[PDB]
Design goal:
Length: 1211
């Protein structure tokens, strides 16, 4: 293994003490911990093993006729898998809680030792030493293992959810989304970590309630049945809350899915969202979903407030109810009965009225999360391949449907075959079926009739270029061996030579997710170069050529496809008729039908804070929650609860110390004796209980309310800042690193931190309370105790110096999981094309293992601290207790009267306070990561103090003066010394090779990065205007069409600013109307995520429909019809000329026949502008680059273009 792990060879004593972990603190005390410091995950805990285990049981649950008479149960598979490993921890839970019940009895026997006798109480002390050793050192290794039972289940679920995700059919990727799958891997599987802690207390709680009522019936007698009567009410009631926690979690997760789904589309769409200035729309949509989500989080947190309010006060109710129903029958005695009742209920309070109510909420949150995962694991999957002989593709009578019903077939009658040495060109209108035909050969679209046979390994060049976070080399190697001569051949043939020469830092350039840091036709050639490097047998080329320049397109077709691939099997989706002459067969599709098939001759980064969670971060978490007056009120309410609680301890003592009195001069004489005012004593004692109950309930709701409200405002600010972040931020930070904050950390601020903060706070006040009376009682003990406080703060800081780093490593090392997930979810058809699924699983497991290394340290370091605390405290408290046997009554005789009592459970409460005090500061690491993206670098303001005139671009004049541009402050100049004037209403063509900076003119115009020189729009500097006044008033069609899941209305007109009649008008003028009319809901048809329901050419047509609606005077048309077929494009060009005749129009296109009817052509060559003249004034100069580029289009094409250039010039 890469790294050791001392747990594999730790001696058992070093294991129970976690003493083997001590060397980690030696470095964490001195350094920020590093991922290379974290110990390797143990071999049995590997993500590969855990997932392959539980998938075995889940396979045996769906299969083997375990479906014969039932639906599958993922819970039965989980139980069958883990029951033996978990029931063996139940036996320790039985011994543990037996020891808790034994402790007060035998210490009570020491209180009964009171009077000394030979060699007697040393038996009880020997039981107390054995008991406290269980409670204080063995408990922690037990607790570590019940936590690892949850980690193992969590990691097993994560593996098999991703194993499923790779297999999901396109029928199923409509029923699920990246938002759900990220939510499964982040919230729903996270429940499993906490569930297995409490799960044994579903039985150890109720069983221990029955044990104490039996023991008190042997002590108090029948009145102990009133204590049990409370539990016989309370525990069935809290069992019914499980039904509400299940319901409320299922509702919450449905809104968390929708939030993460929308957030994913914001983060991926952010550049186009910015250019449209739709940021206000997504701000409202996310804040609506967050309100709906946080409502059910708030309600379920209020039930959790009742549970924790029952923990505080129900024991005091029990000791009230069992005593009021006793003094109405008998007499309260100093120490004696009341000491035994208080200590028995005090020892058992935790399990019956904290861990049991917690267990039934935690498990009811599990079972819904299991149903969420089970309903994912039962989704549809892709069937395995439909030969050692002749390699071929063969398709026969094939018909298939993307949508199972209510539709015409996507493909019908397909009957083609293609052998090595042939290229099949598939051709036809937008949406005709060309990419669906590749999806048929690729097996992503299953046949409903006919058959497909594929004898060879495929390389798929998808129509949208998939590119993943890595180096440009890694994108081309795709895990294949590096081999210099093969690599140089493909980068030459794919024209990535020169591009890898023209700066980029060369090859090995780091590329952001989705290939965002590349031009559209450059990532398209990386996407082609990957396939050619794989040296496959069958090449499925989904039009790689429409993405690239005319010269580069000829270069690719000759030196790559014809040279390298023409000996392979090739199917080429294309629109470039100039290449169809070279295809061995051509196939034309209309509406999925094979129209004709034949021959052309016959057809015609270590972002982790260094140290403490500063006081400012706590202040921000609280001031995000409520105004300070509410926290002053909360402090008063918190102390009012605790004072009322501890006054019941004192009042029973005071009552007992006055019912024990000497004035019983004759007991049979009745009121001749000073019989106690039972109505007065029960009056005040009842009052103190209702104070304890009501202030306990009130503080629990108030803490949850303000901390849930804090999670609301910290989300809101973190989303606004990210939305207003510059595009550079999204190029730099992986999608999964951002979604980690919105999924996991916000999930922690919603559910887990508000609970653990209250749990700490109310434990702190109890410790503060009892210690204070433990300084009124045996006041000398403060002198022994003062060094204990010093040791605890020293041990806390020494621990926290390491624990905070471990928790930052833990939270950080999770973000690769979600960025790899989202990258591979986009890549699925390509991953499944190469059959790289086993490789992508191996990568994903490597991310789980790296996170498991940090979680293993998180669990273990917590237990190192908790052992060191509990050993020191047990030694302290047992010395105080054992001192009674060396007559510590000589230090204070009050030790005999006011029994040691609650100090026996101070050996627990003091520990849980200091232990959970550190847990809260570990949980506050998630607050820092949310605060971090609140405080990120802002983009320039959306509106300045200056604003334009209300009709500002009255003439669409644009002037660039000396301007140069770079995408990052140290980056290369992607544009250099631009100087051009665009006249009013001037239709300007922008042309030049892939990479030449022409789409960076848009980044300068929309100021997505600051240009380094002046740009004037109608005599206003774009640098002296707010970004929404700038961006709203220029229409854009971007190079890559992005669509949002939502209605067609929501995709055309997010603000409802236009009538649906105008939307039908826009759809008619892109001639997409006939398509939308065929869809069952028309305007109300739901887009699948990223628009996947539409063909890529139709995704472009909705982007024109958007720009037609905006009606601005300035339009910027970035390659908008690249994927549109020529016969549909020529009708769109006609409509662009007619619709936007008054506009200025920066038409950026490689299709020069769209450009040639233009007033001026900008030709830019390496970011430098070098030609700006009428098209014919360039073409008549045969030295011009525009002449060369038109010449590269071919002989008759250049003649036709030169002719129509003359026609537009002679006017
Ligand atoms: N993943 C999908 N799920 C459902 N329907 C789809 C999917 N991909 C395409 N379609 C539908 O199939 C029909 C289109 O097909 P295809 O996507 O096969 O066309 P194309 O040949 O790729 O066209 P273009 O390249 O011009 O976009 C379209 O009308 C589209 O609605
Ligand atoms: N977000 C970015 N961050 C850094 N560099 C970028 C970014 N987008 C593009 N580039 C770089 O800027 C230069 C590319 O430009 P642009 O993207 O302006 O070219 P294009 O003319 O639009 O190309 P194509 O015809 O391939 O679409 C390329 O060499 C690319 O590496
Ligand atoms: Mg571009
Ligand atoms: Mg297509």
């Amino acid at each position: 293994e890469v790294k050791p792990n001392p747990l594999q060879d730790a001696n058992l004593c070093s294991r129970v003490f976690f003493w083997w972990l001590n060397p980690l603190f030696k470095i964490g005390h001195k350094r920020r911990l590093e991922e290379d410091d974290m110990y390797s995950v143990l071999p049995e805990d590997r993500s590969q093993h855990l997932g392959e285990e539980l998938q075995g049981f889940w396979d045996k649950e769906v299969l083997r006729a375990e479906n014969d008479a039932q639906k599958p149960s993922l819970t039965r598979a989980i139980i069958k898998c883990y029951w033996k490993s978990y029931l063996v921890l139940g036996i320790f839970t039985l011994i543990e809680e037996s020891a808790k019940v034994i402790q007060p009895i035998f210490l009570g026997k020491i209180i009964n030792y009171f009077s000394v006798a030979l060699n007697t109480a040393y038996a009880y002390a020997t039981v107390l030493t054995f008991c406290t050793l269980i409670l204080a050192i063995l408990h922690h290794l037990y607790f570590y293992h019940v936590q690892c039972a949850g980690m193992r289940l969590r990691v097993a679920m994560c593996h098999m959810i991703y194993r499923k995700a790779l297999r999901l059919s396109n029928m199923a990727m409509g029923k699920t989304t990246t938002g759900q799958i990220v939510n499964l891997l982040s919230n729903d599987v996270n429940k499993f970590d906490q569930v297995t802690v409490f799960l044994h207390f579903l039985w150890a709680g109720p069983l221990q309630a029955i044990a104490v009522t039996a023991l008190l019936w042997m002590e108090i007698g029948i009145s102990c049945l009133a204590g049990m009567a409370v539990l016989i009410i309370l525990l069935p009631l809290q069992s019914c809350f499980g039904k509400l926690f299940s319901s409320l979690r299922s509702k919450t997760a449905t809104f968390t899915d929708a939030r993460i789904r929308t957030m994913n589309e914001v983060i991926t769409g952010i550049r186009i969202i910015k250019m449209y200035a739709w940021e206000k729309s997504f701000s409202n949509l996310i804040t609506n979903l967050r309100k709906k989500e946080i409502s059910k989080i708030l309600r379920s947190s209020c039930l959790r407030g009742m549970n924790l309010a029952s923990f505080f006060s129900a024991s005091k109710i029990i000791v009230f109810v069992t005593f009021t129903t006793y003094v109405l029958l008998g007499s309260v005695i100093t120490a004696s009965r009341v000491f035994v009742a208080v200590t028995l209920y005090g020892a058992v309070r935790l399990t019956v009225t904290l861990f049991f109510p917690s267990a039934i909420e935690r498990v009811s949150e599990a079972i819904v999360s299991i149903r969420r995962i089970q309903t994912f694991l039962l989704l549809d999957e892709i069937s395995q391949r439909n030969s050692d002989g002749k390699k071929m593709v063969h398709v026969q009578d094939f018909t298939a449907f993307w949508d199972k019903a209510s539709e015409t077939p996507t493909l019908q009658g397909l009957s083609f075959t293609v052998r090595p040495g042939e290229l099949l060109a598939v051709v036809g209108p937008v949406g005709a079926g060309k990419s669906s035909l590749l999806s048929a050969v690729l097996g992503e679209l299953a046949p409903s009739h006919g058959l497909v046979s594929v004898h060879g390994r495929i390389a798929y060049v998808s129509q949208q270029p998939w590119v993943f976070s890595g180096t440009l080399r890694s994108n081309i190697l795709f895990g294949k061996k590096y081999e210099k001569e093969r690599y140089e051949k493909v980068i030459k043939a794919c024209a990535l030579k020169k591009d890898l020469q023209l700066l980029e830092d060369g090859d090995l350039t780091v590329i952001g997710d989705r290939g965002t840091t590349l031009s559209g036709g450059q990532k398209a050639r990386v996407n082609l170069a990957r396939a050619v490097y794989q040296d496959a047998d069958i090449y499925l080329l989904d039009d790689p050529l429409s993405a690239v320049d005319a010269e580069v397109s000829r270069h690719l077709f000759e030196l790559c496809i014809c040279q390298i691939l023409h000996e392979k099997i090739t199917i080429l989706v294309t629109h470039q008729l100039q290449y169809l002459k070279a295809a061995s067969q051509i196939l034309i599709l209309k509406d999925g039908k094979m129209v004709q098939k034949g021959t052309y001759t016959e057809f015609l980064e270590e972002n982790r804070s260094e140290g403490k969670v500063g006081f400012q971060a706590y202040k921000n978490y609280f001031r995000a929650g409520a105004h300070w007056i509410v926290f002053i009120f909360l402090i008063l309410l918190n102390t009012a609860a605790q004072v009322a609680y501890v006054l019941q301890d004192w009042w029973l003592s005071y009552w007992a110390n006055k019912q024990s009195m000497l004035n019983v001069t004759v007991n049979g004489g009745g009121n001749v004796t000073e019989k106690l005012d039972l109505n007065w004593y029960l009056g005040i004692y009842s009052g103190l209980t209702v104070a304890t109950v009501l202030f306990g309930i009130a503080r629990s709701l108030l803490v949850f309310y303000v901390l849930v409200n804090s999670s609301q405002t910290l989300h809101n600010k973190m989303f606004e800042s990210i939305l207003k972040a510059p595009v550079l931020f999204f190029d730099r930070n992986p999608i999964g690193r951002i979604l980690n904050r919105f999924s996991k950390d916000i999930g922690h601020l919603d559910d887990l931190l508000p609970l653990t903060f209250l749990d700490f706070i109310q434990t702190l006040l109890q410790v503060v309370g009892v210690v204070s009376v433990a300084v009124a009682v045996i006041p000398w003990i403060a002198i022994p105790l003062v060094p204990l406080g010093i040791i605890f703060i020293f041990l806390r800081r020494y621990f926290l110096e390491t624990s905070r780093d471990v928790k930052r490593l833990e939270s950080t090392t999770r973000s690769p999981v979600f960025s790899h997930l989202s990258s591979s979810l986009q890549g699925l058809w390509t991953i499944r094309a190469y059959k790289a699924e086993e490789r992508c699983q191996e990568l994903f497991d490597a991310h789980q293992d790296l996170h498991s290394e940090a979680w293993f340290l998180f669990l273990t370091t917590s237990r190192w601290f908790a052992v060191r605390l509990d050993a020191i405290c047990a030694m302290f408290v047992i010395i105080v207790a054992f001192g009674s046997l060396i007559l510590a009554k000589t230090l204070d005789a009050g030790q005999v009267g006011l029994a040691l009592s609650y100090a026996l459970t101070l050996m627990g409460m003091f520990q849980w306070c200091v232990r959970q005090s550190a847990e809260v500061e570990n949980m506050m690491i998630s607050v820092e990561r949310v605060i971090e993206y609140t405080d990120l670098e802002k983009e320039a303001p959306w509106e300045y103090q200056k604003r334009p005139p209300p009709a500002w671009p009255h003439e669409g004049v644009i002037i660039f003066d000396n301007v140069n541009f770079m995408y990052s402050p140290g980056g290369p100049l992607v544009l250099k010394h631009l100087t051009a004037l665009i006249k009013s209403q001037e239709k300007v063509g922008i042309v030049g090779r892939t990479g030449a900076g022409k789409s960076s003119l848009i980044s300068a115009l929309f100021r997505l990065s600051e240009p380094e020189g002046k740009i004037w729009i109608d005599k206003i500097l774009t640098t002296e205007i707010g970004l929404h006044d700038l961006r709203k008033k220029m229409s854009i069609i971007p190079q890559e069409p992005v669509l949002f899941t939502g209605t067609m209305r929501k995709n055309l007109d997010p603000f409802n600013e236009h009538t649906d009649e105008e939307l039908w008008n826009a759809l008619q003028e892109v001639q997409l109307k006939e398509t939308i009319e065929d869809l069952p809901g028309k305007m109300d048809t739901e887009l699948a995520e990223s628009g996947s329901n539409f063909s890529v050419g139709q995704r472009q047509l909705v982007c024109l429909a958007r720009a037609i609606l905006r009606k601005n005077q300035i339009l910027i048309i970035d390659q908008a019809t690249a994927n549109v077929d020529p016969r549909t494009d020529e009708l769109i060009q006609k409509k662009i000329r007619e619709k936007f005749a008054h506009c200025t129009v920066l038409t950026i296109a490689h299709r020069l026949n769209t450009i040639i009817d233009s007033d001026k052509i900008m030709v830019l060559d390496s970011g430098r502008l070098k030609e700006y003249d009428e098209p014919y004034v360039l073409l008549q100069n045969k030295e011009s680059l525009f002449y060369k580029m038109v010449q590269q289009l071919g002989k008759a094409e250049a003649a036709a273009l030169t002719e129509t250039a003359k026609q537009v010039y002679f006017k």
